[PDB]
């Protein structure tokens, strides 16, 4: 008995002073009870717009909402520094409610290539039977980045995880760690460990390598 909203885009890069538009399409319901919320990391959402176009008391009037058929739009007429956040649309009917998938509004800046570093496992970790290799992409923009692990020139699949910092509050860059996890037995069976980084700020991909047991 659920209803559905399709929100786009998932992410957008903007500058202070830009006009910003975010859209949600209703699938099943035609209820005009559509609201928009702002959420910042670690905080509860805050109401901005309700009933598709009414501005909530206390909300700056640069926020506005509109409807055209099944399409609902949140507009920020002139983006302010405190407006970089995630935004959610929401639809209710008598019994069900639903939320769109969210849009993160991040800070646009100049393209910045990452600084890449690779870390072999410590001798301490190896005593417990597991090995973690870590690749660090430091202070790059934009967020999109590809990291590929190769062990003895063989491409790895399924034994790595990554995570990314929030955009830096002073230079607006991202940083990323990719951790490759092997058993101690597997790790000692191979020699060359490398991560290959693909990023818009690199003409060709960058590789950082080490040989197991080297200086």
């Amino acid at each position: 008995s659920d209803i559905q909203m399709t929100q786009s885009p998932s992410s957008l890069s903007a500058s202070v002073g830009d006009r910003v538009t975010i859209t949600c399409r209703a699938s099943q319901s035609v209820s005009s009870a559509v609201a928009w919320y702002q959420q910042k990391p670690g905080k509860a959402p805050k109401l901005l717009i309700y009933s598709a176009s009414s501005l909530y008391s206390g909300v700056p009037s640069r926020f506005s909402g509109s409807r055209s058929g099944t399409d609902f739009t949140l507009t920020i007429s002139s983006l302010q520094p405190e407006d970089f956040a995630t935004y959610y649309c929401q639809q209710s009917s008598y019994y069900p409610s639903t939320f769109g998938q969210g849009t993160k509004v991040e800070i646009k800046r100049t393209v910045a290539a990452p600084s890449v570093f690779i870390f072999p496992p410590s001798d301490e970790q190896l005593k417990s039977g597991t090995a973690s290799v870590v690749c660090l992409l430091n202070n790059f923009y934009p967020r999109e980045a590809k990291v590929q692990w190769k062990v003895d020139n063989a491409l790895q699949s399924g034994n790595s995880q990554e995570s990314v910092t929030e955009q830096d509050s002073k230079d607006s860059t991202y940083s990323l760690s990719s951790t490759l996890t092997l058993s101690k037995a597997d790790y000692e069976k191979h020699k060359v460990y490398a991560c290959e980084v693909t990023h818009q700020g690199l003409s060709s991909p960058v590789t950082k390598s080490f040989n197991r047991g080297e200086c």
Binding site: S1, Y50, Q90, S93, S122, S132, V134, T179
Partner: protein, 225 residues
């Protein structure tokens, strides 16, 4: 003034139960509808359930129907979410929020509590192992070296990481934790520093994990010979 305060969150194993409470202050829930919305770590908002406390009318997301029961007690000005047959996918911050009027309206969810954390897992509490991310032998990108600590195999969240007892903050990046297939969490914390200081300055990462009552200091030095 107006307050919604959620409580009752905590750790439970898969298949177990929890009862959340949402206590309102400064308004009567009988004049509103009350809604539970949850947010899994790193994910979007998901509507869970709704109730019209003046009438007892309830509604549920398909993902929780038959396992969750929403209820309200207007004399105590409190709403509840009984959660049975919990699964790992139910791990989330659970928010309570209100909408003006006793039955349906087109008002928004104009006030939200700060939420209560629900963690569904079979993992046992465990303090992390802390391993050095040793700086490399070549003076790396830009006459600056990169070093860090790997904070591995702990449960539950969170850990707190500092460097040099808080004396070193600039250039530090502590990454968000990832949940491994083991059910344990792992993360790294890194910092970039001048290459010319690796012989003079010592770098120590301080890792605290309150649920295990553990505190770890790990000197990170260049690896030798």
């Amino acid at each position: 003034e107006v307050q919604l305060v959620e409580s009752g969150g905590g750790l439970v194993q898969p298949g177990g139960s929890l009862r959340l409470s949402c206590a309102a202050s400064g308004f009567y829930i009988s004049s509103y509808s009350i809604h539970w919305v949850r947010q899994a770590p790193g994910k979007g908002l998901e509507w869970v359930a709704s109730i019209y406390p003046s009438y007892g009318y309830t509604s549920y997301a398909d993902s929780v129907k038959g396992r969750f029961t929403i209820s309200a007690d207007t004399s105590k000005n409190t709403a509840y979410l009984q959660m049975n047959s919990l699964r790992a996918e139910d791990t989330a911050v659970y928010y309570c929020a209100r909408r003006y009027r006793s039955y349906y309206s087109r008002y928004g969810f104009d006030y939200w509590g700060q939420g209560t954390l629900v963690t569904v897992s079979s993992a046992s509490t465990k303090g992390p192992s802390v391993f050095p991310l040793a700086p490399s032998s070549k003076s790396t990108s830009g006459g600056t070296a990169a070093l860090g600590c790997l904070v591995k195999d702990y449960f539950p969240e969170p850990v707190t990481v500092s460097w040099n007892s808080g004396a070193l903050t600039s250039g530090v990046h502590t990454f968000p934790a990832v949940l491994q297939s083991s059910g344990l969490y792992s993360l790294s914390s890194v910092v970039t520093v001048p290459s010319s200081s690796l012989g003079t300055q010592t770098y120590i990462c301080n890792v605290n994990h309150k649920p295990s009552n553990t505190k770890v200091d790990k000197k990170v030095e260049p690896k030798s010979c």
